[PDB]
Design an enzyme around this catalytic site. Structure first.
Site, short mmCIF file in Angstrom:
data_model
loop_
_atom_site.label_atom_id
_atom_site.label_comp_id
_atom_site.label_asym_id
_atom_site.label_seq_id
_atom_site.Cartn_x
_atom_site.Cartn_y
_atom_site.Cartn_z
N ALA A 99 0.81 -1.21 0.00
CA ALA A 99 0.00 0.00 0.00
C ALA A 99 0.85 1.27 0.00
CB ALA A 99 -0.93 0.00 1.20
N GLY A 143 1.35 2.08 8.80
CA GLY A 143 1.43 1.37 7.53
C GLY A 143 0.20 1.56 6.67
N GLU A 183 2.37 8.98 8.37
CA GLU A 183 1.78 8.03 9.31
C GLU A 183 0.69 8.65 10.19
OE1 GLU A 183 5.54 4.91 9.76
OE2 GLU A 183 4.47 5.64 11.53
N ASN A 206 5.51 2.93 19.93
CA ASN A 206 6.87 2.49 19.68
C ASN A 206 7.89 3.36 20.42
OD1 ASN A 206 6.65 0.15 18.17
ND2 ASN A 206 6.81 1.18 16.18
N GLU A 254 -15.63 -10.06 28.41
CA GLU A 254 -15.29 -9.60 29.75
C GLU A 254 -14.26 -8.47 29.73
OE1 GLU A 254 -14.43 -12.79 32.39
OE2 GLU A 254 -14.02 -11.50 34.11
N1 LIG Z 1 6.73 -2.43 17.11
C1 LIG Z 1 6.88 -2.67 15.81
N2 LIG Z 1 6.51 -1.72 14.89
C2 LIG Z 1 6.66 -1.97 13.57
C3 LIG Z 1 7.18 -3.17 13.12
N3 LIG Z 1 7.22 -3.15 11.78
C4 LIG Z 1 6.72 -1.96 11.36
N4 LIG Z 1 6.38 -1.22 12.46
C5 LIG Z 1 5.79 0.13 12.46
O1 LIG Z 1 4.74 0.19 11.52
C6 LIG Z 1 4.69 1.46 10.91
C7 LIG Z 1 4.57 1.30 9.39
O2 LIG Z 1 3.64 0.29 9.10
P1 LIG Z 1 4.08 -1.13 8.48
O3 LIG Z 1 3.47 -2.27 9.26
O4 LIG Z 1 5.58 -1.24 8.45
O5 LIG Z 1 3.54 -1.08 6.97
P2 LIG Z 1 2.41 -2.07 6.40
O6 LIG Z 1 1.36 -2.39 7.43
O7 LIG Z 1 3.05 -3.32 5.86
O8 LIG Z 1 1.70 -1.24 5.22
P3 LIG Z 1 2.46 -0.90 3.84
O9 LIG Z 1 3.86 -1.48 3.85
O10 LIG Z 1 2.51 0.59 3.66
O11 LIG Z 1 1.66 -1.53 2.72
C8 LIG Z 1 5.95 2.21 11.30
O12 LIG Z 1 5.64 3.28 12.15
C9 LIG Z 1 6.79 1.19 12.03
O13 LIG Z 1 7.47 1.78 13.12
C10 LIG Z 1 7.56 -4.14 14.05
O14 LIG Z 1 8.03 -5.21 13.67
N5 LIG Z 1 7.41 -3.88 15.39
#
Ligand SMILES: Nc1nc2c(ncn2[C@@H]2O[C@H](COP(=O)(O)OP(=O)(O)OP(=O)(O)O)[C@@H](O)[C@H]2O)c(=O)[nH]1
Ligand SMILES: Nc1ncnc2c1ncn2[C@@H]1O[C@H](COP(=O)(O)OP(=O)(O)CP(=O)(O)O)[C@@H](O)[C@H]1O
Ligand SMILES: Nc1nc2c(ncn2[C@@H]2O[C@H](COP(=O)(O)OP(=O)(O)O)[C@@H](O)[C@H]2O)c(=O)[nH]1
Ligand SMILES: COc1ccc(C=C2c3ccccc3C(=O)c3ccccc32)cc1O
Ligand SMILES: [Ca+2]
Ligand SMILES: [Mg+2]
Ligand SMILES: [Mg+2]
Lengths: 437, 427, 54, 334
Positions: A99, A143, A183, A206, A254
């Protein structure tokens, strides 16, 4: 016994899902090949752990879970990882192109061509359930997939599973590990669309996890692996009551009952202690009073905020290890006279307590040290609204100039949805204000 | 996610050939197309730029275009000339005579379909084509004229793919003909509409760097291309190697481009080095950070203090303290927060790669979307107007069927682009 | 002060302590939103191809 | 090079602080909405504490304590004193007060009004000043907002020559470590017109505000007697000192008020950090017994003392966190 299905969306959802299910296997003594020697009911049963694991005649215990990402990269590491045998192909769904950090692209454009497939793969799990409670959804706010596709999925589940509960484990965006500048847009957009469809959502900033890893595990630059293993511990503490014998938070309903009096205000603050480094040579084991007191330190919260300047609506304490009610009550009485704990006038000032004698399990080779007793506090406090304030401010700064908006409009989204989402958030901050002050 | 590379004209093919030469060495690929490295990090994302043939032979997904065979015969006889797929050599015979009209309307229109057949043949092999990247100059006829014609026709056939370009801007300091401002102005008009990302490579900047900083008395096109190839390697690092953010052009575009027309980036690089001259002292992280932000290190002759940064992407290469990188990058922003727009929170992102470029223990490449880039377009606009007010040298173009109105329109759009950049500099 | 609802088992126990007393859209509409957004994309693409046609 | 922002333009105290900071050449003022700041001289209302301490690579400090309004609001101060076991209903240095809402503890107030009337002792109060309860309740309901009723000190200490009323203003600085610093220089905001015991209608000798008074400038410059003169008067007229007769009580009251709310506002383990300048208003009766009147969260300084106090703030509250390339404060230890 009632089953629970875990849904992992996007990179954050999947990689956290891997950490959780890894930990789950270690807690129930399940091996990477799905074999559980202690399970003497071969091929079936209705034990507490069966809430999360179904069983095959061959004696394999498989997670009631689906992994979905609009890009194959992350899930491919699940297909070939150490727990490859644990899941089966139909559980691991992948698209072609992601995306691109775009909510609209994940929700409307790419979401439309895969949503039916996902719901069908979910329906296949639900058919293996005798009494489905609902779903636990893991995803990021930032994301494009985690934000965009999640909200679409949550909408349809409310249609196809209207009577079922739906819980969230959501990663709140932090610049120190942010992947995109937009974001905040994606966060506000997915929150607005998902709000009416989520019964209870546990937010993890985070920022908080990053500093806990730096401060207490002495990791200069925490990796996602570092963050996720810590998050999995918190998630485990929250779901342990669904996987083990007990009388507190035994079903998904619950959670809403005990933590969420007001539907919209369904974002409980999680606080965990103690976090200790595995390579810490000498450590003095902490007591019930010490770990319980740590539950009221902002430095231990999943979201940095100040509960002193807010009001509680509910508060659950979840202990694991050598703990007994007597010491808990003694700890609470002491803490009450030292710290500011204001409840809303229409709620009793009290604590629901759950204890599991089995101490927290640690991943071999991990960063966390074994402890004799740990606790996770789930408090619904208006102070978590500080996170909404921060986020909505960043949203306002960019949207005032309509920066990056064309990317969303180009995916078929209307510019009105931005202002509609922001208005819904403005109302949310107001709701928190009425209750809190 | 495969990328299809295209290089058009003399300049385009000479920097293009140099680009493949540099990254082929980084990925361990030899002129034969055979791998001879020591790290799996080299091959993990090599599909982005290379097609894999039987016997594990790696062939660049590159298409070489020109309206004369001169420069492409040099490439084919160059060091890595043999690595290129011979069918991807598409060339004419008449040339374009540094004329945008010839490249865009007459001579190039006659050849463009032959090129698109090669593009289509490459694309159909891609598992999931993400986009294209073009190397060309804006001052000539082929790279400028036909190059932008190609972009338009590629935007007709793959309208949902990303178009990226490395565009060499003309300068009187390094000039071949007087009509370069005409060709450039006509090309910018096209790039504003039909590209998602354009790396502005200013020959004025490249000259000043070679002269003032590198102390080269008489810099050649070869000296200029040492800076370009180094820059091109850097900006494509995250696309070519394993890292935190996962290799695709759309995510770059989304995060770097707040407004669709404002997608013209200022590249930067540190440490600045000349050919042959090896440096023995590796720079400290504070030095990399300071230099990569210095105007003397910018590949676009614009003063970043005369504008504000909308967005910034920085890629550090080599073995270093990623913590120290974080501190130094945060220090720059916190020291000069006035030169960063306040209405885009956290508009500075940084990535690190373990693999350094050849000849350096560590480096830093800068990608900035500054409003100061308007200075580049104003410069071209002034040179354009100086001639156009007298309709000078215009007969070269009207002879190919163009009208004066099309010049007036191109002039107007670039001045609009300038005022758009100025709008956000005072926000 | 007041401990209530004490429930004990082999795995652990749970209870409640009180310190002080008190004082959706349909499948139709969804498919409509998604398709409506799809039309806007088609219109945008048509305007481009028309512009390129000119 | 540190950075700071200014979000309260009307602040005379911190307008001087921002001036001093810039003059060091090691501090750079940014725009209002620039988030990348080290220091924040925040606004008085709706200060966004929630957005503080979330900037990576920046130690952030603000010149206000979140929750300190509970002490600096008259309605809150009464509730705070009555409900806090540390201060207690039996508190001897705070006048008898009650919280009254317009049409709460109105019935509670009348119960005490009776003992005063059925005791034939002093029964004068203040919101206006009156000896009749009905005249006061009718005034509060006519205003609109919430008011506090308080016992009026009918026997105040009176300066000679003049037979004059006065109140004491003490400036207190609480840093990030919650060290309580008392500014050695205070000021007596005096009335020029002699205190009248019978007529409460004339509020020119009962109220000692610097604005109302402005006989102005007769005895001292601007109706403001500093400590050196007031100390001398106490020695000559009453054979005692400011330290012994009054300042011990003042230091006790300040210490007690701030210790009470410490656990509620302390930023010891917070992601951001706070300090704040307070202005304690004290009142002295004829028996040299000090009474707390109120606390100001956004206090102004005296013209003579601006230069010294403002510089002091930079030394212990700002430079203590952000160091650069004997003390005017008295540390109230606890
Ligand atoms: N805590 C944690 N946060 C994560 C991790 N991977 C990505 N993020 C967070 O997720 C956010 C971005 O979303 P992502 O999950 O990487 O992207 P996605 O859901 O795959 O969506 P797209 O790649 O844009 O299609 C960022 O702010 C990252 O810091 C993880 O393994 N652990
Ligand atoms: N209960 C009382 N008994 C005797 N005098 C009192 C009193 N209450 C108030 N005063 C007298 O009250 C005058 C004015 O009001 P108050 O102290 O409430 O000031 P503001 O005007 O509310 C506070 P400041 O202007 O210092 O910020 C006091 O400074 C003093 O002259
Ligand atoms: N950096 C660089 N610029 C070049 C080179 N050759 C030509 N140029 C520039 O490109 C413009 C001429 O375009 P050119 O590529 O020769 O025309 P074309 O072959 O018809 O596309 C002039 O402004 C030159 O300064 C080169 O090798 N390197
Ligand atoms: C300005 O904000 C951002 C700008 C760019 C990106 C992503 C990228 C980027 C994304 C995909 C591929 C390559 C790149 C890069 O080579 C790059 C190099 C350094 C830092 C970021 C970036 C992410 C952002 O949040
Ligand atoms: Ca079983
Ligand atoms: Mg992803
Ligand atoms: Mg040439």
């Amino acid at each position: 016994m009632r089953e629970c299905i875990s849904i992992h969306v996007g990179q954050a959802g999947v990689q956290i899902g891997n950490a959780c299910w890894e930990l789950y296997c270690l807690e129930h003594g399940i091996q990477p090949d799905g074999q559980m020697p202690s399970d003497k009911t071969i091929g079936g049963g209705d034990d507490s752990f069966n809430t999360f694991f179904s069983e095959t005649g061959a004696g394999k215990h498989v997670p009631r879970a689906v992994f979905v990402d609009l890009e194959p990269t992350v899930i491919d590491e699940v297909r070939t990882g150490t727990y490859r045998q644990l899941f089966h192909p139909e559980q691991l769904i992948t698209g072609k192109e992601d995306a691109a950090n775009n909510y609209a692209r994940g929700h409307y454009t790419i979401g439309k061509e895969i949503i039916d497939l996902v719901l069908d793969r979910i329906r296949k799990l639900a058919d293996q359930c005798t009494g489905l409670q609902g779903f636990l959804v893991f995803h990021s706010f930032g994301g494009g997939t985690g934000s965009g596709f999640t909200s679409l999925l949550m909408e349809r589940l409310s249609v196809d599973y209207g009577k079922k509960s739906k819980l969230e484990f959501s990663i709140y965006p932090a610049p120190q590990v942010s992947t995109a500048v937009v974001e905040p847009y994606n966060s506000i957009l997915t929150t607005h669309t998902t709000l009416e469809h989520s019964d209870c959502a546990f937010m993890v900033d985070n920022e908080a996890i990053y500093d806990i890893c730096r401060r207490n595990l002495d990791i200069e630059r925490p990796t996602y692996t570092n963050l996720n293993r810590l998050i999995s511990q918190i998630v485990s503490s929250i779901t342990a009551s669904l996987r083990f014998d007990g009388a507190l938070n035994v079903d998904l309903t619950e959670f809403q009952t005990n933590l969420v009096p007001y539907p919209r205000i369904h974002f409980p603050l999680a606080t965990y202690a103690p976090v200790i480094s595995a390579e810490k040579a000498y450590h003095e084991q902490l007591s019930v009073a010490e770990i319980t007191n740590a539950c009221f330190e902002p430095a231990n919260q999943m979201v940095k905020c100040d509960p002193r300047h807010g009001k509680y609506m509910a508060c659950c304490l979840l202990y694991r290890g050598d703990v007994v009610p007597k010491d808990v009550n003694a700890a609470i009485a002491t803490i009450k006279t030292k710290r500011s704990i204001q409840f809303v006038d229409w709620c009793p000032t009290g604590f629901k307590v759950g204890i599991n004698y089995q101490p927290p399990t640690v991943v071999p080779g991990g960063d966390l040290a074994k402890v004799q007793r740990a606790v996770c506090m789930l408090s619904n406090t208006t102070a978590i609204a500080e996170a909404w304030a921060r986020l909505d401010h960043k949203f306002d700064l960019m949207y005032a100039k309509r920066a990056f908006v064309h990317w969303y409009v180009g995916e078929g989204m209307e510019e009105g949805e931005f202002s509609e989402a922001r208005e819904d958030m403005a109302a949310l901050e107001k709701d928190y204000e009425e209750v809190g002050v | 996610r495969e990328i299809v590379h295209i290089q058009a004209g003399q300049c385009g093919n000479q920097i293009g050939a140099k680009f493949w030469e540099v990254i082929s060495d980084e990925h361990g690929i030899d002129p034969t197309g055979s791998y001879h490295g020591d790290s799996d990090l080299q091959l993990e994302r090599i599909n982005v730029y290379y097609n894999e043939a039987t016997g594990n032979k790696y062939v660049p997904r590159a298409i070489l275009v020109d309206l004369e065979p001169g420069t492409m015969d040099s490439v084919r006889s160059g060091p890595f000339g043999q690595i290129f797929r011979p069918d991807n050599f598409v060339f004419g015979q008449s040339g374009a005579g540094n004329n945008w009209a010839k490249g865009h309307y007459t001579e190039g229109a006659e050849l463009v379909d032959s090129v698109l057949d090669v593009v289509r043949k490459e694309s159909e092999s891609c598992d999931c084509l993400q986009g294209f990247q073009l190397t060309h100059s804006l001052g000539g006829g082929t790279g400028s004229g036909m190059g932008t014609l190609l972009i338009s026709k590629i935007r007709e056939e793959y309208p949902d793919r990303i178009m990226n370009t490395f565009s060499v801007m003309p300068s009187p300091k390094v000039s071949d003909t007087v009509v370069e401002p005409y060709n450039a102005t006509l090309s910018v008009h096209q790039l504003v509409e039909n590209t998602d990302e354009t790396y502005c490579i200013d020959n004025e900047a490249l000259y000043d760097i070679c002269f003032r900083t590198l102390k080269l008395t008489t810099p050649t096109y070869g000296d200029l291309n040492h800076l370009v190839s180094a820059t091109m390697s850097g900006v494509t690092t995250c696309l070519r190697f394993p890292g935190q953010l996962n290799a695709d052009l759309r995510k770059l575009a989304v995060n770097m481009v707040p407004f669709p027309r404002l997608h013209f980036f200022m590249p930067g690089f540190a440490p600045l080095t000349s050919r042959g001259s090896q440096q023995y002292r590796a720079l400290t992280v504070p030095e990399l950070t300071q230099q990569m932000f210095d105007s003397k290190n910018m590949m676009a002759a614009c003063d970043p203090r005369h504008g504000r940064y909308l967005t910034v992407a920085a890629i550090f290469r080599g073995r270093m303290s990623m913590k120290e990188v974080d501190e130094q990058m945060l220090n720059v922003q916190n020291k000069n927060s006035s030169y960063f727009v306040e209405w885009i929170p956290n508009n500075v992102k940084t990535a690190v790669c373990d693999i350094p470029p050849r000849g350096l223990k560590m480096s830093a490449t800068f990608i900035g979307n500054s409003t100061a880039i308007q200075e580049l377009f104003k410069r071209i606009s002034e040179q354009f107007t100086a001639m156009f007010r007298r309709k000078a040298f215009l007969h070269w173009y009207t002879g190919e069927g163009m009208d004066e109105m099309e010049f007036t329109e191109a002039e107007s759009n670039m001045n609009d682009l300038v005022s758009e950049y100025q709008q956000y500099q005072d926000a | 002060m007041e401990v209530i609802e004490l429930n004990k088992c082999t795995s652990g126990q749970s209870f409640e302590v009180i310190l002080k007393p008190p004082s959706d859209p349909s499948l139709e509409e969804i498919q409509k939103k998604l398709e409506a957004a799809e039309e806007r994309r088609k219109y945008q693409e048509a305007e481009l191809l028309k512009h390129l046609a000119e | 090079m540190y950075t700071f922002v200014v979000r309260d333009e009307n602040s005379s105290v911190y307008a001087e602080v921002s001036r001093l900071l810039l003059a060091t050449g090691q501090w750079k003022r940014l725009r209002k909405d620039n988030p990348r700041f080290n220091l924040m001289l925040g606004e008085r209302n709706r200060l966004p504490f929630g957005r503080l301490g979330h900037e990576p690579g920046l130690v952030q400090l603000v010149n206000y304590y979140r929750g300190a309004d509970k002490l600096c609001r008259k309605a809150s101060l009464v509730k705070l004193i009555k409900t806090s076991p540390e201060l207690s209903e039996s508190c001897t240095w705070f006048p008898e007060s009650y919280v009254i809402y317009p049409t709460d503890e109105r019935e509670v107030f009348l119960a005490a009004y009776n003992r005063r009337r059925e005791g034939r002792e002093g029964n004068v109060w203040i919101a206006l000043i009156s000896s009749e309860a009905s005249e006061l309740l009718d005034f509060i309901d006519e205003q609109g907002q919430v008011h506090v009723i308080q016992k009026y000190l009918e026997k105040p200490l009176l300066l000679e020559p003049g037979h004059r009323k006065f109140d004491i203003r003490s400036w207190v600085l609480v840093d990030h470590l919650y060290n309580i610093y008392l500014y050695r220089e205070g000021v007596l905001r005096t009335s020029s017109e002699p205190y009248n015991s019978a007529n409460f209608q004339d509020k020119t000798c009962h109220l000692t505000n610097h604005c109302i008074q402005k006989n102005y400038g007769r005895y001292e410059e601007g109706n403001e007697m500093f400590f050196e003169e007031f100390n001398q008067y106490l020695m000559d007229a009453l054979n005692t000192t400011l330290e012994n007769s009054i300042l011990l009580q003042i230091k006790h009251i300040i210490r007690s008020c701030l210790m009470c709310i410490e656990p509620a506002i302390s930023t010891k383990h917070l992601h951001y950090q706070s300090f704040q300048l307070f202005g304690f208003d004290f009142m002295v009766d004829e028996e040299l017994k000090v009474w707390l009147i109120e606390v100001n969260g956004a206090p102004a300084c005296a013209q003579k003392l601006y230069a010294e106090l403002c510089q002091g703030i930079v030394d212990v509250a700002i430079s203590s966190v952000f160091p650069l390339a004997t003390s005017i404060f008295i540390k109230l230890h606890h």
